[PDB]
Amino acid sequence: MNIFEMLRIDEGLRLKIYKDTEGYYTIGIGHLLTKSPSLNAAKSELDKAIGRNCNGVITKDEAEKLFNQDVDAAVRGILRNAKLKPVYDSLDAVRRCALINMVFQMGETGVAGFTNSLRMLQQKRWAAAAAAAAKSRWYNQTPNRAKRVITTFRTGTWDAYK
């Protein structure tokens, strides 16, 4: 299993604009287009991102290109982030995938807000980190996904995805 396979299972692959759980316009593999309520703006956003007139629909190949970019951005954002970096550095590999997963979904700012879980991850108190992360809006909004990512962090293994 790798970060890509991990995220594809968690986001699914959709070729036409859709609303996320939060009502936000998204496309491809969890690619946020806009928080704006307007589908018009979502379609604009979309043609600008692809560099073509899509009329709200894209190809698998275009979805993958956006994915390659979003994942790369998650990774560099962690590595440049004063708060996220020391955490990432301190972890083993599978747990590192968990943190990237979280940053891809909520952004570097969202994740930096999980102050208490970040601190226990650093301190290697797995159970405490899981319990803290579980008390979050994230958790209550997309529970199956959150449980999988949490379990990943908790255990250091890929069991939840297997």
Residue ranges of the annotated binding site for substrate are: 32, 104, 117
- Tell me: does residue 117 bind Cl ion (CB under 5 A): yes
- Residue of the chain from 135, 141, 157, 159 that contacts Cl ion (CB under 5 A): 135
- Tell me: does residue 105 bind Cl ion (CB under 5 A): no
- Tell me: does residue 2 bind Cl ion (CB under 5 A): no
Cβ atoms of 136 and 17 within 8 Å: the answer is no
- Tell me: does residue 142 bind Cl ion (CB under 5 A): yes
- Residue of the chain from 67, 88, 104, 114 that contacts Cl ion (CB under 5 A): 114
Distances (CA, A) of 117 to 27, 44, 65, 94, 100: 30, 37, 32, 17, 15
Can you tell me whether residue 32 is helix, strand or coil? Answer: strand
- Tell me: does residue 43 bind Cl ion (CB under 5 A): no
Axis-axis angle for helices 143-155, 126-134 (nearest 10)? 170
- Residues tagged in the binding site annotation: 32, 104, 117
Cβ atoms of 17 and 42 within 8 Å: the answer is yes
- Residue of the chain from 95, 145, 148, 154 that contacts Cl ion (CB under 5 A): 145
Q: Please classify residue 122 by burial: count the beta carbons closer than 10 Å to its beta carbon, then call 0-12 exposed, 13-18 middle and 19+ buried.
A: middle
Q: Which residues are catalytic?
A: 11, 20
Question: What are the residues binding Cl ion (CB under 5 A)?
Answer: 114, 116-117, 132, 135, 142, 144-145
